[PDB]
Amino acid sequence: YNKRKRIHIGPGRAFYTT
């Protein structure tokens, strides 16, 4: 899967929901 589609916005498992 293309991991650049996930947007990591803080330490750990903190992502933006797209």
């Epitope: 293309n2 991991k3 650049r4 947007i7 990591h8 916005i9 903190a14 992502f15 933006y16």
Partner: antibody, heavy 123, light 107 residues
């Protein structure tokens, strides 16, 4: 070197459609998200949304959903911001900006910005 | 929806300019800072709270304590006069900027 180069100033009327462009060079354009940012004169930066150029996936500030869409033409490394019906309040400066990478993922900062496109909307 | 910054900071050349940015999302979210000179595009000067891009002078530093991030410019120079914006991400609402701080280097 990474460059984002935006299309020229626009002067339009309310109700008209418009798309403005952001062409990225110096990297793999399809692989980095592009944000679009609005700045009314003398005011701050406001986020409109983001588009991923490899697949045109978009995420919007829902206050602008329904007035704007994004797209990308990967063959010429360009992303677009569209309106189908302008209003006078769309007068502002618009920037595109590249979201950078962190680790294996995209990151949280915009590491390169376009030079801006000034839009004036008036009857 | 904006993070909170002071509207204006004024310092003489050589003095430290300290710009704060606070918001309830900042404690666990990376803060970025951009410099926007008059008539120019924003330029990233700090990301992930404390990291400097290449080509940014070491006189710009960022820090963060709880819900408040601070951009410190030490040895401020005239060319550092600009508006500075902080930024972070709300997990569902996306990119949140501060309101901006106009830093004047007094001449």
């Amino acid at each position: 070197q990474v460059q984002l180069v935006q299309s020229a100033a626009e002067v339009k009327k309310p109700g008209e459609a418009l798309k403005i462009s952001c062409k990225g060079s110096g990297y793999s354009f399809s692989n980095y998200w592009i944000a679009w940012v609005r700045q009314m004169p003398g005011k701050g930066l406001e986020w409109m949304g983001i588009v991923y150029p490899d697949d045109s996936d978009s995420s919007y500030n829902s206050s602008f959903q329904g007035q704007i869409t994004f797209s990308a033409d990967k063959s010429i490394s360009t992303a677009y911001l569209h309106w189908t019906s302008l209003q006078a309040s769309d007068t502002a400066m618009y920037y595109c900006a590249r979201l950078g990478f962190e680790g294996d993922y995209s990151g949280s900062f915009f590491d390169y910005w376009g030079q801006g496109t000034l839009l004036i909307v008036s009857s | 929806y904006e993070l909170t910054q002071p509207p204006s900071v004024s310092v003489s050349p050589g003095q430290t300019a300290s710009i704060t940015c606070s918001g309830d999302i900042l404690g666990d979210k990376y803060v970025s800072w951009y410099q926007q000179k008059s008539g120019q595009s924003p330029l990233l000067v700090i990301y992930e709270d404390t990291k400097r891009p290449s080509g940014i002078p070491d006189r710009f530093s960022g820090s963060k304590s709880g819900n408040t991030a601070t951009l410190t410019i030490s040895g401020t120079q005239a060319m550092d006069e600009a508006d500075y914006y902080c930024q972070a991400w709300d997990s569902t609402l996306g990119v949140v900027f501060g309101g901006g701080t106009k830093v004047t280097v007094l001449g």
